[model samples]
Target: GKRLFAILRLADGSQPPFGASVTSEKGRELGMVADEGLAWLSGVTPGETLSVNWDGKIQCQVNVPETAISDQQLLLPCTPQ
Candidate 1:
């Protein structure tokens, strides 16, 4: 689905994980870890599954919760492997 930029944070609740690659399950790029572990992912739907590629080729999947998100933007937090 087409939407505006959304914010997703690659963090462990308190801190951010830097320099990580965020993408979709089908290998589509959603966003990356910038400062504060904040990522701007656009053009992704709310009920999507996102994958985080971290060190040692270890990857983890984060589900974009199937809930009503106000506006076209939402701030999401996810942990990785």
Candidate 2:
């Protein structure tokens, strides 16, 4: 099983507010954004799409990359939808 550990950042590399829910495109609730926009997901695959939700709606999307499968932390930028 692969785990994706990422920090969602803004265009200027700023972290977003914590506590937003992260979900797989299939609606699986992966985890929540923690301090510094850190979040994790298990059973995820490269090139999958993830969504970040706040206030009960999606705020942005993240396209999981091959590098995310590595042990290193992935800095994923949020693409607003």
Best by TM-score: 2
RMSD per candidate (Å) reads: 3.3, 1.8
Which ten-residue region of model 1 has the weakest summed lDDT? 1-10
**What's the lDDT for residue 17 in model 2?**
76
Per-model TM values vs. the true structure: 0.63, 0.84
Estimate every model's Cα lDDT from 0 to 1. 0.62, 0.80
lDDT of 2 by residue, 4-39 (tens): 788798666666678898888889988788898898
Q: Which residue pairs overlap in candidate 2's backbone?
A: none
Candidate 2 clashes: the total is: 0
The lDDT leader among the candidates is 2
Off by over 4 Å in 1: 1-16, 67-75, 79-81
Give the Å shift of residue 60 in candidate 2.
0.6
Give per-residue lDDT, candidate 1, residue 18: 73
